[PDB]
Design an enzyme around this catalytic site. Structure first.
Site, mmCIF file in Angstrom:
data_model
loop_
_atom_site.group_PDB
_atom_site.id
_atom_site.type_symbol
_atom_site.label_atom_id
_atom_site.label_comp_id
_atom_site.label_asym_id
_atom_site.label_seq_id
_atom_site.Cartn_x
_atom_site.Cartn_y
_atom_site.Cartn_z
ATOM 1 N N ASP A 137 17.990 23.458 -30.165
ATOM 2 C CA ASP A 137 17.983 22.361 -29.463
ATOM 3 C C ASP A 137 16.728 21.579 -28.707
ATOM 4 O O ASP A 137 16.652 20.855 -28.760
ATOM 5 C CB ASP A 137 18.726 22.799 -28.226
ATOM 6 N N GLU B 287 0.787 -1.196 -0.043
ATOM 7 C CA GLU B 287 0.094 0.000 -0.057
ATOM 8 C C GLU B 287 0.916 1.421 -0.068
ATOM 9 O O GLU B 287 0.564 2.270 -0.570
ATOM 10 C CB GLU B 287 -0.991 -0.125 1.269
ATOM 11 N N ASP C 34 20.994 25.560 -25.292
ATOM 12 C CA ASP C 34 20.717 26.738 -25.100
ATOM 13 C C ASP C 34 19.443 27.234 -25.878
ATOM 14 O O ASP C 34 18.328 27.760 -25.269
ATOM 15 C CB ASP C 34 21.775 27.665 -25.083
ATOM 16 N N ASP D 93 25.056 20.564 -27.123
ATOM 17 C CA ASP D 93 25.092 21.745 -28.015
ATOM 18 C C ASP D 93 26.531 22.454 -27.615
ATOM 19 O O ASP D 93 26.769 22.442 -26.410
ATOM 20 C CB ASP D 93 23.881 22.563 -27.510
HETATM 21 MG MG LIG Z 1 22.192 27.388 -29.048
HETATM 22 RB RB LIG Z 2 -1.798 -6.042 2.242
#
Ligand SMILES: [Mg+2]
Ligand SMILES: [Rb+]
Ligand SMILES: CCCCCCCC/C=C\CCCCCCCC(=O)OC[C@H](COP(=O)(O)OCC[N+](C)(C)C)OC(=O)CCCCCCC/C=C/CCCCCCCC
Ligand SMILES: CCCCCCCCCCCCOCCOCCOCCOCCOCCOCCOCCOCCO
Ligand SMILES: CCCCCCCCCCCCOCCOCCOCCOCCOCCOCCOCCOCCO
Ligand SMILES: Cc1cn2cc(C(=O)N(C)CCO)cc(N[C@@H]3CCOc4cccc(C)c43)c2n1
Ligand SMILES: *[C@@H]1O[C@H](CO)[C@@H](O)[C@H](O)[C@H]1NC(C)=O
Ligand SMILES: *[C@@H]1O[C@H](CO)[C@@H](O)[C@H](O)[C@H]1NC(C)=O
Ligand SMILES: *[C@@H]1O[C@H](CO)[C@@H](O)[C@H](O)[C@H]1NC(C)=O
Ligand SMILES: [Rb+]
Ligand SMILES: [Rb+]
Lengths: 261, 987
Positions: free
Chosen positions: B684, B297, B680, B339
């Site tokens: 990208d 649970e 950046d 990049d």
């Molecule tokens: Mg760039």
């Molecule tokens: Rb249980």
């Protein structure tokens, strides 16, 4: 399609051995656990701070003891009596042979274990002590009348001791129904509705292989007809609780009763 | 859209199509009608994000869809029982309620930890409007960028951000910053002629996000808002859908492992229960009882808080994650696609190398000034420094005394700003140094003159003469220099010095860098006195014959942390790949500069450069590195690309579009690679979304890049990433410590009931109590296992093989359930029968007893001692068998948590008191277990009573049995890590 075949067995046998290892540790523990505990007296017996009392014949509907029958109709009480008979089928003096007619009229401490095969001794309560609700004269125990007899019994606890002052009685009444007619009225067998004090205390089903509980009856005389009522049968001793809320069968029995004409 | 023609159009055709004028712009009445027609010149955010249906998705998933199925089966079971009239049917309604209550409160926890994650992102984002200088009705003025409509006429200059997609009509030396769209770190020339038919290579278009560096231009708007080039990259980056995270894969893996056991255990103990002769209703209601115990649970809770403590650990180091799954991802990540421009680099023209005193000096290029600067001792420098400082017109914006100089805003050119920053740091108060040499004559940088120049009066008044400073394209500095400062003296610029300046100019050109020459000349106060009048068009001063000072060169440099960070990830088993839209030369440089390409490795074009073969006849395998340009990548059927990728282990991708960036990640994810990208700009964002975890610079990052990314680095400290892998492998290791703990106990939660089914002993353990284990007693222990440390040197391992190394598996699974749970089950049954016999019930009598035990209509059942108990007294013993099976678990579960601290090393070696959080947790475990029994009224409230202090100690000889089976397991697995025993008894 799983793991290595010829080494599947090499762990399947391990799991086998792992379990026989644990089962044997267990096996030692219970062998010790049994050779730990006393074969006549319970080690702690904690939830037994008071005895339950247990009525007969027991018929529940829903929500607890509901006893409803029409006197004119034989079928409505034919099994109710038949249980009271087959219950007291061990309370016959024939069946109650391995016992003694107690006289002491007070407590019965057996410190000495003298009996067949190092057992001990037990008193007698045969049906006749109920005298009217014993199936003789009336095998309907008052049901045919409208004055039925209810056998009241107390739970048997090793070395439980209820008191000295009087004999431990019973007392059966309404849950107050005062304005509606007279107070209830009952006669009890034997007199004053007492279990004789020489029946206590219990030394265990091993020490007393032929033992039986003491009894009283309660013939219901005042009862009105075609009408629902409830009857508490409180036990009146000093080592007893009859008002415990989360277990209302502790020291008493309640039951719905309708006797129909 | 509307643009692929626009740049190729004539001014007659353009002002026709958009009903405008290339000189006067839109009529106001029509520019207002177009703004209604086309909406505002901005980008519709991902418009649909209702608050309530955010919470909706916080409720589905691996475990949650399991709990729901279990929660349902708790309700299917409850109706079945009350339909044939069963009592205390509460216990089905308690597990259903608790199952649903747990999944709900988890959904809340993350919901705030996104809101707070996305408000802290909303905190770091700038919300002052960008601006355009526009022309309408022949009036130039300022407006906000968003009110530009298709057809408008605008202007730009050095400093202004490009406010729309704009077509160039006249350009005066206009250069621009494209690093957000292209990877081009180099400034780009803008001009009103049609360079290309693809408008990304043509010079006569400015793009909606870009930054104008130096120059000035004027042009028309051709597409606004989403219809821009910018806007259509997020439209793809929104079209991109991201993969399911590695941790969620490992969750739904073992969800299916858990289910598989519940099913067979239900089915077998249903087929078993049918041979005890039950009702089909009841052989199968137990089937449902069985499967529901197999659901822990509370495991969903322990995972989410384990992740939170690592999520918080990262957040303290300026590292924000949106959802807690990505907290892990870095650790298990095996590939980084990175990049360059703006991500590996600073995206800032910085002064790298200088030539003077016949030596190529290299400067400190870093942002925090941690690096290693050059020799400033000699005379030639102080003059050269004077030249570059005085021949410089850029200016700092005011009040910037706090901010580090590299991060300051300068009204000036690209080259001028870089030197001003360089001059400011090396000399100190550059602006005031050149103010005290009052300028009196100045020449702008020119098409016809091709250099900058100025003439000044001198600092002390006893020197009345003048000095002239000049910089420019180095060959145009050398044709006019006949003298050179060398080693103090001023020497003639002879054929030793002529051939030695051209080797250096093209040596630093070899590093791709942009380099200028600097020179000077002192004028005589006789011919050029105080009060002299310099005229320009009449060349009444020397434009030649000057004294050369030196060269100074600039480049896009890496961020200080980056080179260290890159090589720590490689040593952690993570290959790095540069994916940059810059030209292949700058690519290889930064690649080697940071450690993408190692010192001593070559492309095939260096082997055929050393051996001097044609490249045709070189071996591929022998080249450790390779560079692939974006447009030869098209020719590559992906199975060619897969040959290249695992053949050249140090890979570099140049001039790659946002589409190809995505592809490269997709080609890797197709090869079982957990790959993360870092970027950046908007180029990208697509690959930022496809990645298993996309990471975005919280400062240098475009909005779409940060949106598509799963993680953000607000400080732009790239090295924050390596602290992420350590975390992602910590919790991974620490979860299968925490998860293995919470699963073992389900078996001694089930076996007392399984035995209760088939043996019919009085019920050992109650669903009122098994929840208090699942959801109260054992939670603080499980989450403390997050604070386990490494056992190995975690950072020196490969990433996890997704297939072989899993979060749980058949070895870890079977060990935890059927071996440890068996001992905890035997530990309960023993403590059970003791409580039975010692309160009265002989174990042999306990066989088949249950029918009369739970019977309400018996009130005087005889125990083995013949004593008669009422039901409400047998109850309080079945409660004691609860409380005694419960403490059996707790004394067993306290041993279970210590032994997960350490998965290979002996807890002797590592320690007992090691994890001080794990110690504090266990005191909490016994303390609530004490409250649960010996508090007043606990018998009735829950099914626990004050137990006798003998039954406490009965399981303790099973508790310490467990510690010494796993100890000789992880002593035998460390001492003898061979073949047989290292696979079976290891998790
Ligand atoms: Mg760039
Ligand atoms: Rb249980
Ligand atoms: C998945 C695998 C499961 C396999 C489980 C197998 C467990 C079997 C292990 C042990 C069974 C006991 C073996 C019996 C023989 C031992 C010696 C013995 O005979 O001892 C005596 C007791 C009765 O004493 P007495 O009255 O004769 O003594 C007289 C009393 N004085 C001494 C006071 C005078 O013998 C008895 O009770 C006989 C009845 C034994 C008690 C029944 C207990 C039923 C509970 C079983 C649960 C087992 C745990 C399962 C955990 C599995 C986890 C996956
Ligand atoms: C190994 C199986 C279990 C056998 C041991 C059972 C524990 C027995 C506890 C004995 C308790 C002490 O004796 C009772 C009287 O002392 C009262 C203590 O308070
Ligand atoms: C199963 C194999 C492992 C064996 C385990 C043996 C552990 C039990 C040792 C018992 C030794 C007998 O000595 C009894 C010592 O008892 C110590 C605790 O007694 C404290 C009594 O406290 C009373 C309980 O208070 C709760 C309220 O009670 C009502
Ligand atoms: C594995 C397991 C052990 N358990 C114990 C109890 C329990 O001890 N208590 C307090 C009440 C009963 O005595 C209740 C359970 N309840 C489960 C809930 C899921 O579905 C079903 C379906 C049919 C029957 C049941 C019993 C159950 C349960 N399951
Ligand atoms: C009692 O039983 C008789 C016979 O069965 C019947 O005639 C009578 O109506 C019953 N009385 C009541 C009140 O039901
Ligand atoms: C009652 O006790 C007597 C003692 O007087 C005993 O002998 C006898 O067994 C008992 N009565 C009968 C009828 O057996
Ligand atoms: C008990 O029985 C006797 C005769 O059998 C009788 O006289 C007596 O009244 C009965 N008791 C009651 C309370 O009626
Ligand atoms: Rb240097
Ligand atoms: Rb992603």
């Amino acid at each position: 399609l799983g793991r290595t075949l010829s080494r599947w067995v090499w762990i399947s046998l391990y799991y086998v051995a792992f379990y026989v290892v644990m089962s044997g540790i267990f096996a030692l523990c219970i062998y010790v656990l049994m050779r730990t505990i006393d074969p006549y007296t319970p080690d702690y017996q904690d939830q037994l701070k008071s005895p339950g009392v247990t009525l007969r014949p027991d018929v529940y509907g829903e929500k607890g003891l509901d006893i409803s029958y029409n006197v004119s109709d034989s079928t409505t009480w034919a099994g109710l009596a038949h249980t009271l008979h087959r219950f007291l089928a061990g309370y016959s003096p024939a069946a109650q042979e391995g016992s003694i007619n107690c006289t002491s009229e007070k407590y019965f401490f057996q410190e000495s274990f003298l009996a067949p095969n190092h057992t001990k001794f037990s008193c007698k309560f045969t049906a006749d002590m109920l005298q009217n609700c014993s199936g003789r004269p009336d095998p309907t125990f008052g049901f045919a009348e409208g004055k039925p007899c209810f056998i009241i019994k107390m739970n048997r606890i090793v070395k439980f001791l209820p008191g000295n002052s009087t004999a431990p009685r019973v007392d059966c009444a309404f849950l107050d129904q005062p304005r509606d007619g007279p107070p209830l009225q009952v006669e009890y067998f034997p007199a004053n509705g007492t279990y004789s004090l020489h029946y206590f205390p219990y030394y265990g089903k091993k020490a007393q292989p032929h033992y039986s509980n003491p009894l009283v009856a309660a013939k219901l005389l005042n009862v009105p007809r075609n009408r629902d009522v409830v009857i508490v049968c409180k036990i009146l001793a000093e080592h007893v609780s009859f008002d415990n809320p989360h277990d209302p069968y502790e020291g008493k029995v309640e039951f719905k009763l309708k006797i129909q004409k | 859209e509307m643009e692929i023609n626009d740049h190729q159009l004539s001014v007659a055709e353009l002002e026709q199509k958009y009903q405008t004028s290339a000189t006067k712009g839109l009529s106001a009445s029509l520019a207002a009608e177009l703004l209604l027609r086309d909406g505002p010149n901005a980008l519709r955010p991902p418009r649909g994000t209702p608050e309530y249906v955010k919470f909706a998705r916080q409720l589905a998933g691996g475990l949650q869809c399991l709990m729901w199925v279990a929660a349902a089966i708790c309700l299917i079971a409850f109706a079945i029982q009350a339909s044939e009239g069963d009592l205390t049917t509460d216990d089905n309604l308690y597990l259903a309620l608790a199952l649903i209550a747990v999944v709900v409160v988890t959904g809340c926890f993350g919901y705030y930890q996104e809101f707070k994650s996305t408000n802290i992102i909303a905190s770091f984002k700038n919300l002052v409007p960008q601006q355009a200088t526009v022309i309408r009705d022949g009036d130039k003025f300022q407006i906000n960028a968003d009110q530009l409509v298709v057809g408008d006429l605008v202007e730009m200059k050095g400093g202004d951000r490009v406010p729309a997609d704009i077509r160039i009509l006249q350009a005066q030396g206009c250069k621009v910053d494209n690093s957000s769209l292209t990877g081009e770190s180099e400034p780009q020339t803008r001009s009103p002629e049609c360079t290309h038919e693809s408008p990304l290579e043509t010079r006569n278009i400015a793009f909606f996000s870009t930054m104008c560096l130096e120059g000035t231009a004027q042009g028309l708007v051709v597409n606004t808002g989403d219809r821009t080039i910018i806007g259509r990259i997020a439209s793809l980056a929104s079209g991109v859908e991201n993969e399911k995270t590695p941790i969620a894969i490992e969750i739904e893996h073992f969800v299916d492992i858990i289910a598989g056991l519940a099913i067979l255990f239900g089915a077998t103990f249903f087929i078993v229960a049918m041979c005890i002769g039950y009702t089909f209703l009841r052989a199968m209601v137990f089937f449902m009882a069985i499967v529901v115990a197999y659901v822990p649970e509370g495991l969903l809770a322990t995972v989410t808080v384990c992740l939170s403590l690592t999520a918080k650990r990262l957040a303290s180091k300026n590292c924000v994650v949106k959802n807690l799954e990505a907290v892990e991802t870095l650790g298990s990540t095996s590939v980084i696609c990175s990049d360059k421009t703006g991500t590996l680099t600073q995206n800032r023209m910085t002064v790298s190398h200088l030539w003077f005193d016949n030596h190529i000096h290299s400067a400190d290029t870093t942002e925090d000034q941690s690096g290693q600067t050059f020799d400033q001792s000699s005379e030639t420098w102080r003059a050269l420094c004077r030249v570059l400082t005085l021949c410089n017109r850029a200016a700092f914006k005011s009040g910037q005394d706090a901010v580090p100089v590299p991060k300051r805003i300068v009204i000036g050119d690209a080259s001028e700003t870089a030197l001003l920053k360089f001059s400011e740091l090396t000399l100190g108060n550059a602006m005031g140094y050149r103010e005290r040499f009052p300028k009196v004559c100045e020449i702008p940088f020119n098409s016809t003159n091709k250099f900058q120049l100025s003439i000044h009066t001198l600092e002390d008044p006893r020197d009345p003469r003048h000095v002239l400073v000049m910089k420019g394209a180095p060959e145009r500095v050398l044709e006019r220099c006949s003298s050179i400062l060398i080693k103090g003296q001023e020497l003639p610029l002879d054929e030793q010095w002529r051939e030695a300046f051209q080797t250096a100019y093209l040596s630093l050109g070899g590093l791709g860098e942009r380099v200028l020459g600097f020179c000077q000349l002192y004028l005589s106060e006789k011919d050029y006195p105080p009060g002299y009048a310099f005229d320009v068009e009449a060349m009444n001063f020397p434009t030649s014959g000057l004294c050369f000072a030196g060269l100074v060169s600039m480049i896009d440099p890496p961020r200080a942390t980056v080179p260290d960070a890159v090589l720590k990830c490689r040593t952690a088993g993570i290959r790095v790949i540069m994916v940059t839209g810059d030209h292949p030369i700058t690519a290889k440089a930064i690649a080697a500069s940071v450690g993408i390409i190692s010192e001593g490795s070559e492309t095939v074009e260096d082997i055929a450069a050393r051996l001097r073969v044609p490249v045709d006849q070189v071996n591929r395998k022998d080249a450790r590195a390779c560079v692939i340009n974006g447009m030869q990548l098209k020719d590559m059927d992906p199975s060619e690309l897969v040959e290249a990728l695992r053949t050249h282990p140090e890979m570099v991708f140049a001039r790659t579009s946002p589409q190809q960036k995505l592809v490269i990640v997709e080609s890797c994810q197709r090869l079982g690679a957990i790959v993360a990208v870092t970027g950046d700009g908007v180029n990208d964002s697509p690959a930022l979304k496809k990645a298993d975890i996309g990471v975005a610079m919280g400062i240098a990052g475009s909005d779409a890049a940060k949106n598509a990314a799963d993680m953000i680095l607000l400080d732009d400290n790239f090295a924050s990433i390596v602290t992420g892998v350590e975390q992602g492998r910590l919790i991974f290791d620490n979860l299968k410590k925490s998860i293995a703990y919470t699963l073992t106990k389900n078996i001694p939660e089930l076996t007392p009931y399984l035995i209760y089914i088939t043996v019919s002993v009085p019920l050992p353990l109650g669903c009122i109590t098994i929840l208090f284990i699942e959801l109260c007693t054992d939670i603080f222990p499980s989450v403390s296992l997050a604070y386990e440390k490494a056992e190995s040197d975690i950072m020196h391992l490969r990433p996890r093989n997704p297939k072989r190394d899993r979060l749980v598996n058949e070895p870890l699974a079977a060990y935890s359930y059927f071996q440890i749970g068996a001992i905890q089950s035997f530990a309960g049954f023993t403590d059970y029968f003791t409580a039975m016999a010692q309160e009265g019930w002989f174990p042999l009598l306990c066989v088949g007893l249950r029918p009369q035990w739970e019977n309400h209509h018996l009130q005087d059942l005889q125990d083995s001692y013949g004593q008669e108990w009422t039901f409400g007294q047998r109850l309080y013993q079945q409660y004691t068998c609860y409380t005694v099976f419960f403490i059996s678990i707790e004394m067993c579960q306290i041993a279970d948590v210590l032994i997960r601290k350490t998965r290979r090393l002996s807890a002797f070696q590592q320690g007992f008191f090691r994890n001080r959080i794990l110690v504090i947790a266990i005191v909490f475990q016994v303390c609530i277990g004490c409250f649960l029994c010996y508090c007043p009224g606990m018998p009735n409230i829950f099914n626990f009573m004050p137990i006798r202090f003998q039954w406490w100690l009965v399981p303790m000889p099973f508790s310490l049995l467990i510690f010494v089976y796993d100890e000789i397991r992880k002593l035998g697995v460390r001492c003898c890590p061979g073949s047989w025993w290292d696979q079976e008894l290891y998790y």
